[PDB]
Amino acid sequence: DEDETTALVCDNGSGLVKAGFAGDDAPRAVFPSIVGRPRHQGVMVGMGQKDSYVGDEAQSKRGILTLKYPIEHGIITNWDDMEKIWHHTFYNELRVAPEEHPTLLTEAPLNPKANREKMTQIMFETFNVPAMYVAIQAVLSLYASGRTTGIVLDSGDGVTHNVPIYEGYALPHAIMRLDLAGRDLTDYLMKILTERGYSFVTTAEREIVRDIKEKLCYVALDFENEMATAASSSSLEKSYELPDGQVITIGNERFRCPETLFQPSFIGMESAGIHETTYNSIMKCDIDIRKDLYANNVMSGGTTMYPGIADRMQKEITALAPSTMKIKIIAPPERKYSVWIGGSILASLSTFQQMWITKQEYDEAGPSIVHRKCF
Amino acid sequence: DEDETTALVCDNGSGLVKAGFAGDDAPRAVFPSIVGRPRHQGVMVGMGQKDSYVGDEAQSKRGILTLKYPIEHGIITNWDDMEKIWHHTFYNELRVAPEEHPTLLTEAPLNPKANREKMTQIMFETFNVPAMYVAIQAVLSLYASGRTTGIVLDSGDGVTHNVPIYEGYALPHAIMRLDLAGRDLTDYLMKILTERGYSFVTTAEREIVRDIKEKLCYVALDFENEMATAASSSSLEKSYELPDGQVITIGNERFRCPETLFQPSFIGMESAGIHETTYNSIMKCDIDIRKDLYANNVMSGGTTMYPGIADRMQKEITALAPSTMKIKIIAPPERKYSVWIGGSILASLSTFQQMWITKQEYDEAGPSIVHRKCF
Amino acid sequence: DEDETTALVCDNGSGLVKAGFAGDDAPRAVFPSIVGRPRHQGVMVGMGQKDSYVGDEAQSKRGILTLKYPIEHGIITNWDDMEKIWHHTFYNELRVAPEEHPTLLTEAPLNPKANREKMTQIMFETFNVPAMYVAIQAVLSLYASGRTTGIVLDSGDGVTHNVPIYEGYALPHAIMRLDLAGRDLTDYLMKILTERGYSFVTTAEREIVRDIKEKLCYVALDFENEMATAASSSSLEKSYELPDGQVITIGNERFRCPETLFQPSFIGMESAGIHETTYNSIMKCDIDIRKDLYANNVMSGGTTMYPGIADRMQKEITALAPSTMKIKIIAPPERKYSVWIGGSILASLSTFQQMWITKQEYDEAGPSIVHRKCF
Amino acid sequence: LDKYSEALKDAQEKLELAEKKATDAEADVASLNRRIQLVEEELDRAQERLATALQKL
Amino acid sequence: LDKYSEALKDAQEKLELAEKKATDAEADVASLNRRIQLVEEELDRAQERLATALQKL
CATH class of the missing domain: 3.30.420.40 (ATPase, nucleotide binding domain)
Incomplete structure (x- = not known):
């Protein structure tokens, strides 16, 4: 639906995928890095129902799905689910077919090599992208x-x-x-909410705790003093509406969750x-x-x-x-979206137009080319 | 157990401590220069469990300990941990009280002065050694x-x-x-082992990388030709057994780390x-x-x-x-042990007996005497 | 652009390079005798960044550069880097091309012949200076x-x-x-400060030590009385501020380093x-x-x-x-700058206008002419 | 909802602009404090160097 | 409506506070612009005083 053959940018995190086209100041759409699958036996005939759901479909039908993340601690291990997410992201919602646009992907510099190599391989071989660049x-x-x-x-x-x-x-x-x-901070919160009588152990419950965290938690600039009153009075609690009409309030759990950033020992990290x-x-x-x-x-x-x-x-x-x-x-305010935005900036810089792997060099060298041409 | 007041000899680095008695040709015991501390909360009682572990105790119980060493780039900055290492070294493994035996410690020629001065002070004031000599x-x-x-x-x-x-x-x-x-080589190797998909970020993992390096790595004579085949085939990979039964195979990383010695830029060194x-x-x-x-x-x-x-x-x-x-x-072959051995030699030579600081001269002058008596 | 075609004057040392025009009482600019080069892999694109930096550029961007000095013990060993320095010194900074002005350079009377010959050659062949005279x-x-x-x-x-x-x-x-x-005094100070617990080995560290020396060091007319107190009391120490906010204090070492000019054995010199x-x-x-x-x-x-x-x-x-x-x-007071000032004085003498090698005589004889015409 | 959403996009845009103004004004409070301290330091140094020049005088 | 109303009262309050912060930050820039002009002039004067002491020297 775009009127220019600009590059595409897709920030595939372990959480959510931010995607849109190069040169913009924001992703056009955000999809979770999720492929969902039913964990129940179908009862009715002629109900449609997919074997797997992708992105926002996986969250929309999540009431009976187990939701899996193809990317673990920044690395893609399930490339098949990545391809499903990318096809949906690029062709159904962002309306940009990669075949007509070069594509930029993002990753930590110490992200194991298979990540950058597999992402490059899939965009060139299943999407026929004219060029690639892992940033x-x-x-x-x-x-x-x-x-x-x-x-x-x-x-x-x-x-x-x-x-x-x-x-x-x-x-x-x-x-x-x-x-x-952030995934570990969420897990810590789930265990401490369990301590308070709110046990969240299934996928729907996990996705809800993440949403609660995003709206209710804060770091505190003095953990011990903030805890001294948060643990003593309802005056430092904040409520959240659960999807089923139930409510939850969060007290010192509200700050203990982000505190793990300052104290990783909270989740067993040295x-x-x-x-x-x-x-x-x-x-x-x-x-x-x-x-x-x-x-x-x-x-x-x-x-x-x-x-x-x-x-x-x-x-x-x-x-x-x-x-x-x-x-x-x-x-x-360009926080959390900064990697995608950086992708947009970089993909469109004149100083970056020589950094793209074309789909010539790619086939002559294979996907391992990413280690010579990108980073 | 000795039949003479032979000098005690210790070679103390940021890696390991080698210790034994003068006149021998090997240390009686080797310890990592480590004092270990538990990083977990005890749950059971009547489990023994120390506040701190020293040397081999720290290594044997390392699964739950953070392991710190007192020596950085050749200098002791944490004398308390060295005091504990020496007490264990001398009294438990060498089975000697320094009070009846003179002691020879070592340092590099341009090592900051505080090292030889503090080592002299601790052996004379906490161990009551009759004499000292920093080699x-x-x-x-x-x-x-x-x-x-x-x-x-x-x-x-x-x-x-x-x-x-x-x-x-x-x-x-x-x-x-x-x-x-060697400590930079351990750090470099874990970054390139991360590239292969194996994360090493905790103390136990750090010491494992050190053990991998010692057994699997080499420099060879021609880096580029060795890399040309190591990077192309599994035929130059070697498996290392991780303590949990899993393995890691190492390819050109097997030499890319050691190569840092010839190319220090690999660790950011000028x-x-x-x-x-x-x-x-x-x-x-x-x-x-x-x-x-x-x-x-x-x-x-x-x-x-x-x-x-x-x-x-x-x-x-x-x-x-x-x-x-x-x-x-x-x-x-006296590699890795030769400095300790030389300590044994210098201490056993008759040509060295006039070089000792006695615990008379020491108290009259204080520990600064080491700069007049040793070198 | 200038009022008269007077000589450009430039004193090229192993430390600093200074230049201005003949007839004034100061150089317009002082540069370190440095050509800098990046020692890191660039990751961002469109950041500018030169392949090599000259003079003050090299020092200003030194955080990621290794810095080299083309002149050692009074002679040029790297004429390519001096060519870069002279271009910057004369044309980029004094805004005068040597092509339109005589140039006066300098060298010691027992300075190896190759250096006075190379200075003559480069200014005539790469800068096309109409005349030369090495003072x-x-x-x-x-x-x-x-x-x-x-x-x-x-x-x-x-x-x-x-x-x-x-x-x-x-x-x-x-x-x-x-x-x-003076270069040896700087390296001696890096080593003596290492003995004090403040190690210095890299380019940035050497530039800090040269700055410490230039602000804190002294000779002491009576060093025995000065060290008897300076080596005994903190009242003789002076604090220096490092680029990152650290503070180093120096006591008798403050004058012991300069003392090497009287006591050369401190650096192994006979x-x-x-x-x-x-x-x-x-x-x-x-x-x-x-x-x-x-x-x-x-x-x-x-x-x-x-x-x-x-x-x-x-x-x-x-x-x-x-x-x-x-x-x-x-x-x-015309200290350190006295050679440049004298250069200006020599260049403006009416009797000195008969001492110049013209860019005629130069090509007929070649650079060996410096020994026939200058000294 | 559209009125609150719009009143919000406007309060929020005015906020991003006010926050930007504050960010930039603060970038300048800081750039000014850096220049003030650089100049106050050059001034104190001019005064240290003056006291020295006067002592050397 | 409540989420936007809440986001609005917060965007608007943050706006009053961001604008205040911007005003205060700008006021600090203005106070600091004065500190610059005052210290800048004192530095030019100190440099002249220094030059004077040195010229007298």
Whole structure:
């Protein structure tokens, strides 16, 4: 339905897929990274009913479906479900057939190689895309935020890569990859809501807790003092309407969930938190770089939308940082959508038009070409 | 259990601590330089369980411990953890109380002064050792390796020191201390093992990567040709058994990590590599010294235990060296143990008995005495 | 564009490069003698970023660059990088192409011939300068000082020259050229600060140490009394602010590093030191020429800004010198810049217009002409 | 709903614009504080260098 | 209607506060513009005082 052969951008996270065309300032549509399947025996004849549901279909019919995510901690393992999501995304809802448009995909720099190789293979072999480019989230986040220099701490759904960039250059020895993300924060919340009498264990229940989290949780700039009153009074609780007419309120669980970002030990991870990893990515860069990264701490990914996160992270780094240095956080409304936006920016830059793999080079080399041409 | 007041000898790095008695040719025990701490909440009672674990205790119970070491790039910053390591080392495994035995500790020639000063203070004030002597690791390496002249290439867990000695004398202006070491190789290997799909982010995982490196990795003599086949076929992969029964196969990563020694840029280091660095130590020495240093490049410490390293270093150094001149590398089986062994030798030599700080001179002057009495 | 086609004047040292036009009393700009190159992989596109940086560009963007110096111990070893420096120095910054102006460069009178020949060659063949003249640095120091008689001791970053000049004549048999200089003082300080617990090895670290030296170091006219206190008390320490907000304090090391100019053994050099070489430049001249050289010790070049150097250079000479005789140090504000200033003075003399190599004579004879026409 | 949704897109757009104004104004509070401190530091240094120049005078 | 009403009272309150913050941030820029002009002039003057002390020197 587009009137120009622009590139397509599709940000396939472990959570949701943001997609639209290159050159825009927003995805045109957002689909979950989900393929749903019925977990019940059909009773009635002539009811239609699919073997599998894709994207928004999977959530729309979720009452009797188990919902699976093809991407685990940022890596695609179920390429067949990815192809279903992409076909739906590109042909039914975004109305852009990849055959007529080059496509840009996104990923952490330490995302295992199979991710970038398989994504490249599917767009060239099942979609016949004329060209491909797998982009890095740290690059995409600095473009979206208007920076060339800074720390990208993407507190997304899958894995946090924590990658410093200076004057457009990677500083790879200072990358701190952390096995903590939004999906784990949600799981922690489900266990503590169980402690309060609200047990959520099935798919519909899990998707609901994620929605509750997104609307009710906040980080708190002082966990212990906030907990001292949240755990003592209803005055710090917030309600949520459950789809069936029941209601839930959340107390210290409201902040304990995001607290895992500062205390990963809450989910069994051996880590001091996202602010220590951010601190180390600044600290491990050269001494003449450190000052610029302290002043350009970039929050990216989702979870950046928990109230107070932009401020607590500046406080936590300031507390670790040397005096004299300016510590500052960048946290635009283009949060959580920053990787997709960076994709749009990058795909359409004149400086990027030589970075695309065409469907010539691809067949001569095979999908492993992504490791030579993209990253 | 000893029939003489033989000196105790310990070689303490960021990796492991080797300890035994003077006059022997191997340590009596080896411990990681680690004090372990539980990272989980105890649930059962009457389970024993320590607040902290030391050395092999820390390693045996590591499944639930965070493991920290007191030594960074050759310097002890956490004396409390070294005090615990030494108490265990001396009293439980060596079965000796230092009060009745003088002690020899070691450090690199350009190691910050606080190391030798604090080590002297702790052995005299918490262990009541009758005497102390902090040795030069390069001296100990030369005795153990059968040389008086040469370049000591320790390439250890902390730093590579690259120090030339001629006729038993230091040539300090030519020491090329380099921030390239075994601990950086462990970090590099896990990043490239992440590329293969195996995540190693916790302490137990870190120590496993260290064990993988030690058993599977090598440098060989020609990186590009070795990579051409390692990157093309499974025929150059080797399986490593992970503790849970699963395996990891390692391909060109098997050498790409070790290659960092020749290409330090792999870990973000501004360096030409160990062969050029060795060469520069020789080139900064007078021409009537150089002939003996070229013919006597001597390996000590660790990482010198990679297959192909003595032979590649000879090739890489002779390629930089003047023609006619004979370039040779000494790489004895006393590898990884040679600094400790040299400690045993220096302590057993009659030529060294006047070099000890007594616990008289020590108390009259304080620990700063080490800078007048040792080197 | 200029009022007159006067010579461009530029003093190219192993440290700094300075330039301006003949007839003024200062260079327009000072650059480090540096060509910088990225040591990192770029990831963002359209970030500008040069393949190589020159002078102040190289230092300003140093966070991700490795920085090289084309000049060592007074000579150019990398003429390609000097070509880049001269283009930047003369055309990009003074805004004058050498094509339309004579150029006056400088070199020590015992400076290896290849360097005075290469400077002549590049300015004539790559810049098409209409004329050349490579100045004697000692002469320029005398022109700036207002002396015709004295010992010019230029203690710069590269080499200490030590040349006796009487009534405008050199006494070449008495020149004590010495390979002891400010660059060694910087590296010694990196190593001594490592001993204090503040390691420095990389380019950024070296530039910090050069900045520490330039702001905190001194010679001390009586170093024994100065170190007796400085090595005993914190009241003699001075704090320095590092680029990342760290603070380093330096005590007796603050003057012990500069002390190497009198105590060369600190860096492994076999030398009598700068005060004895001044003495011998005087003493090796005839007795009717020494009575004037003793009274005229001419200080020039950089490192001359350390407090105590003039008094320390006069006291030591006085101690070596015969009694009755008056020993005097001349240490003008035109320090470090005295060679450039003298260059301006030489270039504007009416009698100097007969000293130029024209771009005619140059091509007929080739660059060896510098030894027929300049010195 | 359309009125609240529209009143919202407008309160929200005015908010993004006010927040942007604040972000940019703050970017400038900070750029001004950086210039103020750079200039105050150059001033204090001019005064340190003045006190020194006066002492050296 | 309530979600948009709530989002609206919040967008509008945040707007009053974002505009206030913008006003305060802009007011700080204005106070700081004054701090710049005042410190800038003092620096030019300090540089002149420094030059004067040095010229006297």
